[PDB]
Amino acid sequence: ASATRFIQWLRNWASGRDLQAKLQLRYQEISKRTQPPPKLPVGPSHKLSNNYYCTR
């Protein structure tokens, strides 16, 4: 993302593609490396009644 406009034009022409739209190096679009804590759901057997193991 630091290439001069001339070099950007040069490599786009040589490749035939708009390379700047799909750079293979990652910048700020990637997710933060610190995330809020999750709160994961529980499965269908997490019940207080009508849940005898012999029926599942």
Ligand X SMILES: CCCCCCCCCCCCCCCCCC(=O)OC[C@H](COP(=O)([O-])OCC(O)COP(=O)([O-])OC[C@@H](COC(=O)CCCCCCCCCCCCCCCCC)OC(=O)CCCCCCCCCCCCCCCCC)OC(=O)CCCCCCCCCCCCCCCCC
Would you tell me which residues interact with another protein (CB under 8 A)?
1-7, 10-17, 19, 22-40, 43
CB of 25 to ligand X, least distance (A): 13
Under DSSP, is residue 12 helix (H, G, I), strand (E, B) or coil? helix
Q: State phi, psi for 49 to the nearest 5 degrees.
A: -160, 165
Question: If residue 10 lies in a helix (H) or strand (E), which one and from where to where?
Answer: helix 5-15
- Of 1, 6, 28, 54, the one binding ligand X (CB under 6 A) is 6
**Of 1, 2, 42, 43, which lies in the binding site for ligand X, with binding defined by CB under 6 A?**
2
As a whole number of angstroms, the distance between CA 23 and CA 25 comes to 5
List residues binding ligand X (CB under 6 A): 2-4, 6-7
